[PDB]
């Protein structure tokens, strides 16, 4: 989710 | 946008029955056409979703076919519980304009 | 295992406007669901398409219907509802709630529409 | 400072059928000399885990590299979510192919999903001319750095 933040 | 459906069309047990849609040529002729199949009294159904492939559960029937700016529906082995009407649906630039109706009778 | 119902009213007059609602069950409205949509239908008569809506908010109208018709979702309810404006006596329809559930299929689900006589 | 970006869908689908991938992606970050629209192809890379398979492409200015990871995912039953090595939790049903949405999870962007039928994928990314390969559903999803890629099959004919 960080990532695709 | 309409796509000038005919009205009704007929057709005998055991026969095949060719259904057409003429398209503007701006919205049938690239946009995915799909053929939805509705019994009177009751909301449609999907019957044929792209313009070739086949949903799950349909029968084998069912053909759908989109040359240039026209579509045809094509039902072999007709049988008596296919009288339903069948309708034409496609995109045209973010409007979803569907068929004018086609009454099958056998 | 996606269900639509509407819940609109059976009877309505001109000097009002119409509104329907389109409640989801066995699912919600998400970024996951690609459009909702309404489509109505005159008795002996082919099937219009009203209006389409996207979970955020994003609405695409018919040119024919853009100026009478508005429609509004509520995600806290998982429901989305459709105002029409003007109405006259060839909106005298089945109203069915449609949307699009499977990648290709396009219009795969389609609510159980409810009567509307003017 | 360095930042990732998925590549522009046309440029996938570039990669997949040439093995080319296009510089400048788009505001514009050219990778040198400020030129751009040229083919560059992919390099079989070092070896850095035994599961990746990585083919890179350069193997205040601004460097563009253009990477192809072929990892390994995993899936428990259900099949409701797929985890890649590299991270890459995606709750999207490995064995959903764009027809069974009520046999099958899907929860990801609705908008950033596609599938493609018969899709032709270059057999190695390395070699710069491949015999092209025909896959029956490849379906794709964009996400904030990166696009996922992979064969969809029918769950009943490789799950036991
Ligand atoms: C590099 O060349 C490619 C291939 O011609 C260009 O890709 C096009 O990009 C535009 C803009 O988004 C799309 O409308 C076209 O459909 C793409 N081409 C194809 C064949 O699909 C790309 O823009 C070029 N990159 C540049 C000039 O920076
Ligand atoms: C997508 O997957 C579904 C199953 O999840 C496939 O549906 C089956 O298709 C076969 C092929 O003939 C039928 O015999 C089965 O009855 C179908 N249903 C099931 C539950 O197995 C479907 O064909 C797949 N592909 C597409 C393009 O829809
Ligand atoms: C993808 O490829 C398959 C396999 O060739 C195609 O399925 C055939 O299509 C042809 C032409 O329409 C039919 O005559 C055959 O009966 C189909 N089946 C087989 C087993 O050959 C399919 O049409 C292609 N395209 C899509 C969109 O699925
Ligand atoms: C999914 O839809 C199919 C349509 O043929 C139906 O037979 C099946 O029961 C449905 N499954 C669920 C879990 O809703
Ligand atoms: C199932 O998998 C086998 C082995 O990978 C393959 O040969 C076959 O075509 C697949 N499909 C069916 C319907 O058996």
Redesign the pocket.
């Known amino acids: 989710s960080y990532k695709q933040r | 946008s309409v796509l000038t459906q005919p009205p009704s069309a007929s057709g005998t047990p055991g026969q095949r029955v060719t259904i057409s849609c003429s398209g503007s040529s701006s919205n049938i002729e690239t946009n995915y056409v799909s053929w939805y199949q509705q019994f009177p009294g009751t909301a449609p159904k999907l019957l044929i979703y792209r313009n070739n492939?086949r949903?799950?559960?349909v029968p084998d029937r069912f053909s759908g076919s989109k040359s240039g700016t026209s579509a045809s529906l094509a039902i072999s082995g007709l049988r008596s519980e296919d009288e339903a009407e069948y309708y034409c649906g496609t995109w045209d630039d973010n409007s979803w304009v569907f068929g004018g109706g086609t009454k099958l009778t056998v | 295992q996606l269900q639509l119902q509407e819940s609109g009213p059976g009877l309505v007059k001109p000097s009002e406007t119409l509104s329907l609602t389109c409640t989801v069950s066995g699912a919600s409205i998400d970024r996951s669901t690609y459009y909702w949509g309404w489509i109505r239908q005159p008795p002996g008569k082919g099937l219009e398409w009203i209006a389409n809506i996207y979970y955020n908010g994003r609405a695409v109208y018919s040119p024919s219907l853009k100026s009478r018709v508005t429609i509004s979702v509520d995600t806290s309810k998982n429901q989305f509802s459709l105002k029409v404006r003007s109405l006259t006596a060839a909106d005298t329809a089945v109203y069915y709630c449609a949307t699009r559930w499977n990648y290709?299929f396009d219009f795969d689900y389609w609510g159980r529409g409810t009567l509307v006589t003017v | 400072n360095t930042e990732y970006v998925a590549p522009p869908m046309w440029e996938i689908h570039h990669i997949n059928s040439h093995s080319q991938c296009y510089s400048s992606y788009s505001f514009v970050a050219y990778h040198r000399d400020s030129y751009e629209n040229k083919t560059m192809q992919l390099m079989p890379d070092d070896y850095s885990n035994t599961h990746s398979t990585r083919y890179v492409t350069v193997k205040e200015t601004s460097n563009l590299n253009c990477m192809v990871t072929i990892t390994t995912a995993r899936s428990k039953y259900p099949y409701h979510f797929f985890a890649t090595s590299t991270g890459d939790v995606v709750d999207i049903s490995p064995?959903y192919?764009?027809?069974?949405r009520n046999?099958?999870y899907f929860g990801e962007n609705a908008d950033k999903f596609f599938i493609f039928?018969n899709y032709t994928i270059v057999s190695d990314f390395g070699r710069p001319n491949s015999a092209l390969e025909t896959h029956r559903?490849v379906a794709f999803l964009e996400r904030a750095d990166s696009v996922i890629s992979w064969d969809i099959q029918?769950?009943?004919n490789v799950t036991c």
């Open positions: 492939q949903p799950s559960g | 290709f | 064995f192919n764009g027809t069974n046999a099958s039928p559903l029918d769950e009943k």
